[model samples]
Target: PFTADKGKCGLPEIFDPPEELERKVWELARLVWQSSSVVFHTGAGISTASGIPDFRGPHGVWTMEERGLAPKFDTTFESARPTQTHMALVQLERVGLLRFLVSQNVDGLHVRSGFPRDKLAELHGNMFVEECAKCKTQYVRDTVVGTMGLKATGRLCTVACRGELRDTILDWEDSLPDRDLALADEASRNADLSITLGTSLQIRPSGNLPLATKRRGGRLVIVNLQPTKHDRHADLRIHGYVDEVMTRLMKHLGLEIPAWDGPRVLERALPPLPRPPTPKLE
Candidate 1:
């Protein structure tokens, strides 16, 4: 829930909707339209519509009591795939309304949703990827293990020659990848309007984009279920389902999104595995 004092908006109370919030959201959308460049930062909440569970919240997949694991950031999306919100961003990109997107989700939904590779900055590494620790060479998860008969493991580095295999993502206690952080910083600095969807804006560096944009005189907008630290800094904040909001936003922008097929390329390329039951938290 988001909470804010009158005349001074911070994070909104959880699930609490004020009467004027939707109108405020539209105000920000109009700003996006007026801006020369816009950047969207997304998180796990954006993919919840696909039936994938988040690590936080009541229905989260990685609850401390159920997994006996500390409440830390981790993701596993072996079954559920990209959702409509992901596809909407792809539509925005295709129409040239979006400048670029920076995402913290490792599910590969952005790519699966058909966003161009060059325009997206996946701050968190994808589950279906591997990179070289020494030389920074990257490889698709299937390409490394499928061709070599080695199991495709996360966090292993793969330089063509003789370097350590590392997972592309930044794990607990690991620093953010330098190149990704720099790209995010640059995008934030240059954006005329910045929108954050589904993320609570709690993660560092990745969480810093909204503030960076604000400092650069760009209008900020956030759409998330829970309260994010950046709410006060934003020109407008909306609490709702990201996909629904995006669906409407696309219509407003006059962009039509085609129905997306599942994991168009990776479905055939990855190794087969038994389907896991949809996880539920007690």
Candidate 2:
């Protein structure tokens, strides 16, 4: 049942509990930190902190059917940029606590957030990179003008080589990347503990990681604002703000996250746009 105070705006019924659940969640988080490697599997919920809405929830971007949006595609890297949640994961990687991250999001926030390339596997692909249809050559799309032309103009082939320019993101009807899937499988199998944040374990194939980890005898912990079908399988279930939980967990683990350091890195890694040539007066 949904309470009036807690259930405003048609929010789904969440799994709120007494002190025991909180204690167990902290315990599981501690276990994750102590493990040799910890993989974080995330979804749209993580980006909610940056004003982006989760697609499946009441407060989500596509909650209204009248909008006729493309569901998950609406928030791709071409649309929304990386959020604070994405940066938090990067901070984890920088501090050496995060071993790997497998994201179902096609928004490319994980990569944009400064996570090391070797430690990250974007199972669904990203919008910032393009692949050649013939040679499968990967190239970064660094300019807003180029991205706009590709998306709005429907020029689906590379300009230089004329090969099919496929966005790195997995569009509807697209299959998961083979390499990413294998890596995720390996990470899940070898991890001693795993944390699932923001995603409901509903999307096929990609949703299989949590279950895979559980099957391999690794502890599973789920953190989301709403209850997921796989909650019963989790050793610890937390219904709270993702950033807040992560912040507390990092503090508990003795990880030092420096303030004012992230923006500088982002500026360097993702350089600002060059000014357009002054419009010529005809």
Candidate 3:
């Protein structure tokens, strides 16, 4: 049950009427087509349909905590498939509309969607990835690393360095990774359009990265079910389910939403993963 109140955390769940949403979706499509470079910022709300619980929605984990209730999850991270929004972003990247992706989610769906690591910045770290301390090489596992807070995973690096593999998930007060942050910041500044999907934009630094585009004279578009912290700064705001909005936007752009075949593990360096039997290489 949704026990969280609108006044509790100041995040109110909102939805635009069907016709209003249609108009905004068209506007968003125009913005996408007009922009030269686009950067997308995604959050937990985008993964809620994939069975992962978000942190600040009406039925979010933190929202339940505010009411002294337990939170619920629809599926484990291993079984959850990428949502339409994830696949849409992958297609956008494949077509070269999306220049860079900045995500605050640790669920690893973006990586599983086969989005290139070079074009993405997972600022919050990933559940299924571990980084070598010495060489900084990342390893993507088929399963969660079972640790958080950048702790040593008690696993040796596969590379010749034999460095310690540390979990990439961050804890409270942990700083964002240098490489990911740098890439995201640079991309945001260079983008002519910034579209945020399903995030409340609550977390600092990561949430604030979109401002770099707006401050640099880029257009800001916010697509969320709740009012984002930067709503006032947006050139357009469309309150709707991310999956639904992305579907219509892709249709407007005359693009096909890439289907999720299965989980694909991606790492930063070393021996490449064997190609899947039915490869969909770009």
Candidate 4:
């Protein structure tokens, strides 16, 4: 059932009622309690509440494009804050419940939410991050890099190599970074529960990574408002807004979604700027 070609443009949207969604969310929370190693696969849907548009939703960018309408953006990527789901994941990681995070989105919300760098695999790269071609040191800027598809960002690394910095966002046909992909693959396989949030799982490689968990006897829980390619494989499917589901699920788990203060960058690759030498005493 795994095809390499692009799927249909418009898939029917599905939403469960409040009662059903609440019950299913409770079940999802139970799954979280049952599993030890939990891996989360996040997509554009998780950020929709933050004012970003998904690609295949009822009013998604690609869906509107296919309908011959211009795209709509309620908030710029720079101004969009992380939604409740993003903050919940942060608490999940902080409490040692989530083992890894695999994201197919390039909007940079996950990284901006203060998620640990080593625990996350941004398969599609990030808009706020640019990498050194030679030294591979990534710099997370406060603003968008203003380019895409790995183009040179007109900057150089401060390291001795002085490699050109390139955008990390991947263009169509771009290959997934080996390091991120490998981390996702291993995390997916090792997880006892793989939960997908806000994604339809249409794209290849990144989309199919969650199957590794189910194929290896792990349970797969999908939280989306539309039918996913791997719906049949899901142990539990909940059709609801990701923010609502996460808000309720956290309450069920007796954990509060951490409040977002503001934008914060966590970059470990680059060293601090060198300081000037102190003056000698007379």
RMSD of each: 11.0, 12.3, 6.6, 10.3
Write one digit per residue (lDDT tens) for candidate 2, span 33-136.
Answer: 45677888998788876556676676555454324553344343445555555666766666556667888875556655566566766777765666666677
lDDT of 3 by residue, 1-282 (tens): 254232324277788999999999988988887788999999999999998988888888787888888668898898989999999998888777788999999999999988888889999999999999999988888899989989999998888588989999988768999999999999999999999998888788998999899976899999998888889999999999999999999888878887788997544322333321221222
* Each prediction's whole-model lDDT (CA): 0.66, 0.64, 0.87, 0.87
- In every candidate, how many clashes are there? 12, 0, 0, 0
Q: Which 10 consecutive residues of model 1 have the lowest summed lDDT?
A: 1-10
Indicate the residue-level lDDT of 241 in model 2: 74
Q: TM-score winner between 1 and 2, please give it.
A: 1
After superposing all C-alphas onto the true structure, candidate 2 shows an RMSD in angstroms of: 12.3
The deviation in Å at residue 188 for candidate 1 is 0.3
Root-mean-square deviation of Cα positions for candidate 4 versus the true structure, in angstroms: 10.3
Clashing pairs in 4: none
Evaluate residue 87 in candidate 2 and report its C-alpha lDDT on the 0 to 100 scale. Answer: 65
Cα lDDT, model 4, residue 154: 94
TM-scores for all predictions: 0.76, 0.74, 0.91, 0.91
